[PDB]
Design a protein around this ligand. Structure first.
Ligand code: MN
Ligand code: MN
Ligand code: MN
Ligand code: MN
Lengths: 360, 360, 360, 360
């Protein structure tokens, strides 16, 4: 019955704790109900082929036009249509599926986690990226985050400095924190196998719990090798740019952990398809992020809530990086977790004034 | 909101065109809504480790008790719980998930296909197993089924007679029918690789469209080999006894086609998990059956309706084999297809009198 | 000459040191001889798809009817028939083959180990699962078991608590016991490869002799990987759900040790088929248990007696867990071993009164 | 109870339809019972490393001495002992296990097939090697054998003449016989992969049912390749020189059919170990022969009788090649089969006079 009448893709720049750009989606349905979503990336084109500009451009010019007039309640049909009409564009697709799921949740008065099957938990463990680039600074922030019971899992973004420097930094931090916190790294494809061979060993020998995307996705055999040789488990993130990529990697034994990002898969339903594959292969899960705001973070969270298990938790800390939001409901972070309300849809409403404010 | 108050597993023997036993499930919810499902097999234990007797025994003694008091609306949590409490028992689990999905569909007034994402079609191509055991009779039945436009896809159950005899039979039928019908075989694991090597070639060289489960699931390498050497595509059925089996087979390249049976996977949601994996690997789909009645057939159909594509259609002909049904709504078979109503749930209601009649 | 006249499957709940349920089998032969067997599992459906209820249901409804009138002396023909009529149901099949072997042993006045070829030993090393869940408690029990010379091999059931907690627990116990006892673990599929990677290393680096089923049977490649990378040998248990599973695993190099459980294979003859395959591949053996009572334990033992070698002994401690038995002859545990009499059959007779007592 | 008191290995040369040498074994037990066996090969050392001379030499000097005093009833222990004391020597071991099984069968009054588990059939299909070396003669012999209903399955020993000549010969014979008989070849390792590539295709394209050992056992990859490319199934014979060889081949996918020869495995129990492995891998079976007399043929037959299935029958025609036998009971060949009596042991007794006659 309800139809998709219009979809708006709005580029919004928000201040952080330094701007963060999100593409807010608003799908208006003939039944008066409106869903909101979010297609967010990091650094224009540096973390994916989809920039905020390219995202809005294609939604406006291609994806949205293909949906107007379609049943808002038939998300599958809509999303399958988007797949027949467009190659990739998972970020843009993710924002749209998120909005459609939100709209469908308010319409049925069910939270998205329920639309997606039913939550098995009401909160998710949330990791925190220590980014000060200063070891002492990072250890202080870690101790602080532990103090206020906000985070007990920390990840270090490395690979940008000499291998030995990052190794020192990361091992110093773990050394200092001990068993009071879990320490992980994310090399974001910065190392080549020859560099990863030694670093991975050192990290694993010094209490690092997991090594996220050490080398580039272009070296598949190296991932398979490190998944066999690293003392510390290897997690695939950038290597997954789609659900089929997830199967490919699982079939190869390229990672014992898969990071789950709706943006890299195509939305909440798409990320569960990847998760489903991981569970079938026996691969461990992790709730990933592209540093989304509450909308994208909640879209992710609602999906992760249905997961039987997330051995390595999540890094759904995106909203805490922003000093301003475009939704009224502030994220609920208490005791190392993100608490998700049972309210319908994503449980979020737009802060119209701020939207107008930061919309570029 | 609504809770699972009581689940009934009823063994029903129905006359066929020779009895057919189904285990009818009735899950009654605290909100007055009741869902019906079906856990059906063929021949006691000859086609699966789950017999009608074992199915009712375990639902009563284990599965059902674990669900009473649980939210009827949180199907994922319920089914995940059944997985934590019981190994296998996909048939029993399938009947229960089917009933839960039915009950949830009436409660929200949405057809199960929609609960499952949204249908991309309203009917499914239906194949017909020619069973007369007589070549001439089978060819007659084929032409008859073509005439009344009920079936244009036929499968022959072989492997029970000498290889040459079945080969002759099957090739004679295809030759006689020409391009007016698609002819497939299902050897039900009856051949060993050494027998399949020649038969598969002959069948493929004589217009047989696909070869369903030629050899036993115990010979994995043989399946991988035949998937590489058969002139006719190899479809995996019995080899899949779970979603993880589907991943295993896909990772191996053991079949270019996967038959989808909710019974062998654990229900409508479980069969879609397997289908999702097949789609990710690029494996072709087929809607399979354990010869369910309208309930199981409709539970399957509602899931298959959301599938982007089913290259080889379905064999959802189960209800046409029975001369009596325990539901009021007769299956809609017209023009080589099974038509699925948009009505809520499975769109079926129990024929109380007949239920009482055939319930053993 | 002698025929199978009737088979009784009796569900018996016995008190333990907390109930333990066994399905006692009684096969009555036309020659007056009667054999007894046992189909026992742990926790209904939590350790196998076969529950006590499902076991009795299928024996009564399917397996037994197929055997009445058949030659009691032709166990092969009978068991092969059960395989043609039923998929899986190894537990139920195991109880029946055990009873048939017992009956055939009394009839020929030969112990089952002899029927099975001939014993090469008269006793088996028996391991003991320390289960108190309390480290200090477990170390005390270990020291005690060593004292009375009952056990010098101990296994810890882990995987239910955080990896670090179980690691600590297990390493603390080994540390404390030193070279006076062998310490093994059984994770019962509780870990996912990403968790097993580090735990296995730690365990192997701290004197743990072997790691039983660290990850789930759904992750085959992970087993192959850990069988290559674990400092401590990997043993397959739950991964084997049949003799063909054993071949599959051996062909893959998924474990350097196979646990031998008649229940998971289909009986004493079936477990030897698996053992035979293991010996051919060079895979090490272990006498496994589903915590059977004296009947199932003796059925297992009689088979394990014919084994050339059992590098890691057995865990045939099932009877010591029960405070009551349904057989008259008490198990012979002395000097870290289970001593098997040369008496005919299993060397056991039913304690009719107790049978009637605990039969549910 | 009964012990092995003395074992005699007697070399006997028998006239054929041209001599055939067998090593007759006589194991005398302390209980008065005596078992007879046979260790027979073809051509001294040309078909195995074990010649009649080497066989008697080692039994006398090594195997037999190790058994005197041992329990005649504990065959497993005895045979396992022979394995600990001697590498290979399967022929010699086979004659001894055969004799032990015979002696144990008379002692218990059970036929060997029963000692081995229980027969599932009373006769076996018997193939016939057409050896005239003349196409026309061979076709005549084939029609004759069909007429008297003695054989309907024929094999041609090829590989000794140019590939084309043998191809012509073999294809001419099949063409001439049509579907009235099954035609197979045995190249006895005579071809190298480069020759087999074309021949196998031609043979398979001209109705040859299977290709026995086309190339040498030294080329493992070639066997794996031909098992993948031959239009006609590949059977392994010479490649199997032990049970572990059988596992190796099955693990490799080197043949879809395994020939079963007790001589190449180590006796009736050993051949069943190989058969069990084949059944587990899904490999097809065939009862092979080294052209044994009634003793070796019956030892084989009693084992093959317990086999669930032998897709390609047997070639147990050995006794029909001899014009004189050293046993009193003449083999029962009627209607394409060898009929096995239910009598105890092998059902054979020595023809003392003839034994003394032909014993070299
Ligand atoms: Mn990452
Ligand atoms: Mn099928
Ligand atoms: Mn275990
Ligand atoms: Mn041969």
């Amino acid at each position: 019955s309800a139809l998709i009448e219009r979809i708006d893709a709005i580029i919004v720049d928000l201040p952080t704790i330094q701007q963060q750009t999100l593409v807010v989606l608003r799908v208006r349905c003939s039944d008066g109900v409106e869903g909101i979503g979010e297609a967010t990336t990091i650094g224009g084109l540096a973390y994916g082929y989809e920039s905020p500009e390219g995202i809005k451009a294609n939604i406006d010019a291609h994806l949205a036009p293909a949906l107007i007039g379609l049943a808002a309640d038939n998300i599958n049909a809509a999303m399958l249509k988007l797949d027949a009409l467009a190659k990739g564009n998972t970020f843009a697709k993710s924002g749209i599926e998120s909005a459609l799921l939100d709209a469908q949740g308010k319409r049925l008065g069910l939270p998205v986690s329920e639309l997606l099957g039913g939550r098995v938990r009401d909160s998710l463990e949330v990791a925190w990226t220590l980014a000060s680039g200063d070891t002492a600074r990072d250890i202080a922030e870690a101790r602080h985050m532990l103090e206020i019971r906000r985070h007990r899992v920390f990840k270090l973004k490395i690979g940008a400095n000499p291998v030995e420097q990052n190794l020192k930094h990361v091992v110093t931090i773990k050394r200092e924190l001990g068993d009071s916190a879990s320490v992980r790294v994310d090399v974001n494809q910065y190392w080549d196998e020859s560099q990863a061979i030694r670093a991975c060993q050192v990290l694993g020998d010094n209490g690092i719990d997991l090594i996220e995307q050490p080398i580039s996705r272009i070296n598949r055999g190296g991932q398979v090798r490190l998944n066999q040789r690293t003392p510390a488990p290897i997690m695939a993130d950038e290597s997954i740019e789609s659900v089929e990529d997830a199967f490919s990697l699982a079939a190869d034994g390229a990672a014992s952990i898969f990071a789950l990002k709706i943006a890299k898969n195509g939305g909440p339903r798409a990320v569960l398809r990847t998760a489903q594959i991981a569970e079938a292969a026996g691969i461990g899960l992790y709730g990933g992020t592209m540093l989304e705001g509450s909308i994208g973070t909640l879209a992710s969270a609602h999906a992760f809530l249905t997961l039987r298990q997330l051995t390595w938790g999540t890094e759904l800390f995106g909203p805490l990086l922003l000093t301003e939001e475009i939704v009224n409901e502030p994220p609920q972070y208490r005791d190392f977790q993100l608490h998700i309300p049972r309210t319908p849809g994503l449980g979020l409403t737009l802060d119209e004034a701020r939207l107008a404010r930061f919309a570029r």
